[PDB]
Amino acid sequence: MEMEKEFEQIDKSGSWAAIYQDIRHEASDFPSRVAKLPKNKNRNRYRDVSPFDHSRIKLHQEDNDYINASLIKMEEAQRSYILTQGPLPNTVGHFWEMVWEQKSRGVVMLNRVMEKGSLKCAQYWPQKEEKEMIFEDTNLKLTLISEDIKSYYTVRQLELENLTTQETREILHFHYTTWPDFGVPESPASFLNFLFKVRESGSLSPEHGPVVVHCSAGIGRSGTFCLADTCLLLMDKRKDPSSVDIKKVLLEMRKFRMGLIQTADQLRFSYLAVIEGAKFIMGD
Numbered sequence: 135m136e137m138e139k140e141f142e143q144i145d146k147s148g149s150w151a152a153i154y155q156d157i158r159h160e161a162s163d164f165p166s167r168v169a170k171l172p173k174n175k176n177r178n179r180y181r182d183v184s185p186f187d188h189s190r191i192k193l194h195q196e197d198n199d200y201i202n203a204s205l206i207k208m209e210e211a212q213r214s215y216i217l218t219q220g221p222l223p224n225t226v227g228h229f230w231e232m233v234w235e236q237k238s239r240g241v242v243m244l245n246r247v248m249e250k251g252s253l254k255c256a257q258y259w260p261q262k263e264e265k266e267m268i269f270e271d272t273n274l275k276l277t278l279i280s281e282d283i284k285s286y287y288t289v290r291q292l293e294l295e296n297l298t299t300q301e302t303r304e305i306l307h308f309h310y311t312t313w314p315d316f317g318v319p320e321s322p323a324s325f326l327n328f329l330f331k332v333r334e335s336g337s338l339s340p341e342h343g344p345v346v347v348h349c350s351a352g353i354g355r356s357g358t359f360c361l362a363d364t365c366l367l368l369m370d371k372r373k374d375p376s377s378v379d380i381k382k383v384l385l386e387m388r389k390f391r392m393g394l395i396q397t398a399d400q401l402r403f404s405y406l407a408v409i410e411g412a413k414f415i416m417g418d
């Protein structure tokens with residue numbers, strides 16, 4: 135079925151939970167043996183969220199190459215994304231090592247450091263220009279260059295230096311700051327505006343490594359971001375945009391990381407975002 139009318143048909147019939155459970159039943163199951171080794175327990179935020187072995191990002195290190203991060207490679211859309219958990223106190227150096235080694239331009243953050251009164255990820259970037267951060271375990275230096283605070287998101291320019299080689303690179307930090315502590319946003323308008331700002335920066339384009347996207351577990355809000363982006367790109371590429379099947383795209387993405395889209399409310403929100411976004415693209 136088309137999307138917008140399949141949407142109204144699920145609303146009127148109140149069957150979002152049943153649609154979402156079908157997706158969960160059909161989703162791929164692949165091994166994640168490296169994630170579960172005892173030496174990696176303090177590298178995982180949640181025991182039930184792990185990268186598959188076949189698609190996990192490897193650190194370029196001979197001691198321990200493990201990070202909780204996955205490469206989502208979308209062949210028809212010609213987009214790739216790295217989805218990862220919010221960094222932990224003992225993985226902030228690994229996080230920036232990955233950004234460096236994978237040649238990423240941008241980092242997309244969809245959570246606040248504290249939500250619901252608890253810490254959802256480490257304070258992994260510097261908050262003042264004159265107070266830079268050094269990660270001694272991976273030999274990197276990180277400096278805040280500039281910061282632009284808007285009503286729904288903040289953009290930061292960061293400098294990452296590889297202290298072994300003295301090479302430097304500019305990284306863009308895109309921070310969506312207004313996702314509610316409970317539920318999903320009422321309108322997708324600010325999330326879509328945010329997605330378009332990431333796109334306009336070059337961070338999603340083939341001349342760079344894959345964008346790094348995270349929330350707390352790296353599957354829920356993060357899944358919504360890449361699902362909406364890929365569906366809108368396919369609608370632009372194909373002769374028949376009504377042939378884009380959001381449930382099929384989500385199942386393809388779940389071949390590369392488990393659990394993408396965590397609730398039936400997140401599924402409905404993804405439909406809403408793609409539907410509204412397709413009207414703004416045109417060309418109208």
Ligand SMILES: O=C(O)c1csc(-c2ccc(C(F)(F)F)cc2)n1
Binds near residue numbers: 211372373
């Ligand atoms: O209209 C359609 O349904 C349509 C148009 S292009 C397309 C398609 C393109 C590429 C690939 C892949 F090889 F890249 F995987 C798979 C499907 N489907």
